[PDB]
Scaffold this active site. Structure first.
Site, PDB file in Angstrom:
ATOM      1  N   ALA A 244       0.826  -1.203   0.000  1.00 49.79           N
ATOM      2  CA  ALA A 244       0.000   0.000   0.000  1.00 49.79           C
ATOM      3  C   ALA A 244       0.853   1.242   0.000  1.00 49.79           C
ATOM      4  CB  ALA A 244      -0.921   0.014   1.214  1.00 49.79           C
ATOM      5  N   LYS A 250       7.632   9.218   1.594  1.00 50.97           N
ATOM      6  CA  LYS A 250       8.966   9.189   1.005  1.00 50.97           C
ATOM      7  C   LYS A 250       9.632  10.572   1.214  1.00 50.97           C
ATOM      8  CE  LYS A 250       9.596   4.990  -0.139  1.00 50.97           C
ATOM      9  NZ  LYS A 250       8.780   4.671   1.058  1.00 50.97           N
ATOM     10  N   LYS A 274       0.668  26.094   2.785  1.00 47.53           N
ATOM     11  CA  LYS A 274       1.156  25.048   3.653  1.00 47.53           C
ATOM     12  C   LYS A 274       2.674  25.178   3.679  1.00 47.53           C
ATOM     13  CE  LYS A 274      -3.134  23.495   2.749  1.00 47.53           C
ATOM     14  NZ  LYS A 274      -4.155  24.388   2.134  1.00 47.53           N
TER      15      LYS A 274
END
Ligand SMILES: C[S@@+](CC[C@H](N)C(=O)[O-])C[C@H]1O[C@@H](n2cnc3c(N)ncnc32)[C@H](O)[C@@H]1O
Ligand SMILES: O=c1oc2cc(O)ccc2s1
Length: 380
Positions: A244, A250, A274
Site C-alpha cells: 500500500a 517518502k 502550507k
C-alpha cells in the site's frame, strides 16, 4: 577519517511515489484554473484503488477521474499483467472543502504578503558543495539509478522492466574541516519489478552493465564494491498490489537522503500556504544561496512557524565549521536578504505555478533549475 553514508531513492511506480505524483497532479489541475486554490490532497493506493482524501477549496472545475488516470498512465501502469491499470482501476474521492476554522485563521481577509502560515511546524534546508547541484552524492546517484531504469523501460531496451523500483547507494567519504569528500561507492542495491519471463541472471547482468555502469562513474567503482541486485530473488508482484502506498511516505527521498535533518512535513498535494512545502523550498533556497555565494561549504537551515502567524518563529543556521563567519553572522546575512513569510515566498519562488507534478519523483531538490535552485545574490 573515513565513514560510510547511505541514501535511497524510489522509482515513479513505487506505490508511495504514485501517491505523491497523483496528489501533485490534482494540485496542478486546480492551479491551472485557480491560482489561489487551497489544496490538501492525500492519496492512498492499494490493489486496484486510488483514493483521494482531504480538503480543497477552489473555483476550478476538475475532473478527478481524468486527472488521476492520466497520472497513472504517465507512470506506466497500463495493463493488469503489470498489476495495475489506469483504464480499469477504481478512483474513489473523499474530498471536502477546507475547514472554515483553518481558513479564517490563516488567509480569510488577509493581505497576501501577510497571510498566516497554514499550520505550525519546523522545516530544514540543506546544501553541500560535494556536487555542482549542491546535493549529497549518495542521493543524487540513487535518484539517477531510478531515472535510468525508467528510461530503459520507456525506450524498450529492457522491456521486462515494470514501473516499481527502489535503489540504495552507500558512499565511503573522507571528512575535510566539516565538509565531506566522496571517495568511492561501497554498496549499491537495486530492486525492480519485472515480468514473469525474464531470468534472474539476465536481470542482474543488465542492472550492472546497462544501469549501474551507465550512471555511476567508474572512478567510484572498484573490485570491492558490493552489489545487491534483485536481492529478494523475485519481484513480479509490485506497485500498489505488492504494498500500500500513501502520500508523504517518502519525505527523505524527496529531500536529502538522510543528510541534514527533516521537520516531518510532506510536500505533495499542498498549495503554498502550507509551509511544510513553501518554507522547505525557501530553506533549500537559503542553504544553496549560502553555499553558491561562497559563505560555507555545507549548511543546515532550520525555520519554524505557528498556524496563522506570517513570520517564522525561529531561524537557525548551522555551518558544520565550514565558514570563516560565525553561524550568528550567517544568520544576520540570512535575515537581511530573505523574507520567509509564506506570502512573500510565493512571489519569490512563483509558487502558484502548476509545476508540482514535476517535483513529485526523483527528489524536489538539485534538479531542473526550479526557482528554489537558482541562488539569490547576497548583500552584506
Ligand atoms: C518490501 S515492500 C514493504 C513490505 C510489505 N508491505 C510487506 O507486506 O512485507 C516495500 C517496497 O519494496 C518494493 N518491493 C515490493 N515487492 C518486492 C519484492 N518482491 N522484492 C523487492 N522489493 C519489493 C516495493 O517498491 C514496495 O513498495
Ligand atoms: O537524472 C537525474 O539527475 C538528478 C540530479 C540530482 O541532483 C538529483 C536527482 C536527479 S535524477
Amino acid at each position: 577519517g573515513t565513514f560510510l553514508f547511505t541514501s535511497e531513492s524510489v522509482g515513479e511506480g513505487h506505490p508511495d511515489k504514485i501517491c505523491d505524483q497523483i496528489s501533485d497532479a490534482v494540485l496542478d489541475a486546480h492551479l491551472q484554473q485557480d491560482p489561489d486554490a487551497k489544496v490538501a490532497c492525500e492519496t492512498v493506493a492499494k490493489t486496484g484503488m486510488i483514493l483521494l482524501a482531504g480538503e480543497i477549496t477552489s473555483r476550478a472545475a476538475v475532473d478527478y477521474q481524468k486527472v488521476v488516470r492520466e497520472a497513472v498512465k504517465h507512470i506506466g501502469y497500463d495493463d493488469s499483467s503489470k498489476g495495475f491499470d489506469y483504464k480499469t482501476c477504481n478512483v474513489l474521492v473523499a474530498l471536502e472543502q477546507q475547514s472554515p476554522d483553518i481558513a479564517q485563521g490563516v488567509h480569510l481577509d488577509r493581505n497576501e504578503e501577510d497571510i498566516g502560515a497554514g499550520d505550525q511546524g519546523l522545516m530544514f534546508g540543506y546544501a553541500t558543495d560535494e556536487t555542482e547541484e549542491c546535493m549529497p552524492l549518495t542521493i543524487v546517484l540513487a535518484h539517477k539509478l531510478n531515472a535510468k531504469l525508467a528510461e530503459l523501460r520507456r525506450n524498450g531496451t529492457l522491456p521486462w522492466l515494470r514501473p516499481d523500483s527502489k535503489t540504495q547507494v552507500t558512499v565511503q567519504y573522507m571528512q575535510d574541516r566539516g565538509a565531506v569528500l566522496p571517495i568511492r561507492v561501497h554498496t549499491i542495491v537495486i530492486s525492480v519489478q519485472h515480468d514473469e519471463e525474464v531470468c534472474l541472471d539476465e536481470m542482474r547482468d543488465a542492472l550492472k552493465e546497462k544501469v549501474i555502469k551507465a550512471v555511476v562513474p567508474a572512478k567510484y567503482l572498484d573490485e570491492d564494491t558490493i552489489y545487491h541486485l534483485q536481492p529478494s530473488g523475485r519481484f513480479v508482484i509490485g506497485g500498489p498490489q505488492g504494498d500500500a502506498g500513501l502520500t508523504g511516505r517518502k519525505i527523505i527521498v524527496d529531500t536529502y537522503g538522510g543528510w541534514g535533518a527533516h521537520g516531518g512535513g510532506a510536500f505533495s498535494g499542498k498549495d503554498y500556504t502550507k509551509v511544510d512545502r513553501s518554507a522547505a523550498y525557501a530553506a533549500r533556497w537559503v542553504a544553496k544561496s549560502l553555499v553558491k555565494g561562497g559563505l560555507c561549504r555545507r549548511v543546515l537551515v532550520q525555520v519554524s512557524y505557528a498556524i496563522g502567524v506570517s513570520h517564522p518563529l525561529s531561524i537557525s543556521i548551522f555551518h558544520y565549521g565550514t565558514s570563516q563567519k560565525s553561524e550568528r553572522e550567517l544568520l544576520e546575512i540570512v535575515k537581511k536578504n530573505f523574507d520567509l513569510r509564506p506570502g512573500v515566498i510565493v512571489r519569490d519562488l512563483d509558487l502558484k505555478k502548476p509545476i508540482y507534478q514535476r517535483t513529485a519523483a526523483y527528489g524536489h531538490f538539485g534538479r531542473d533549475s526550479f526557482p528554489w535552485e537558482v541562488p539569490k545574490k547576497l548583500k552584506y
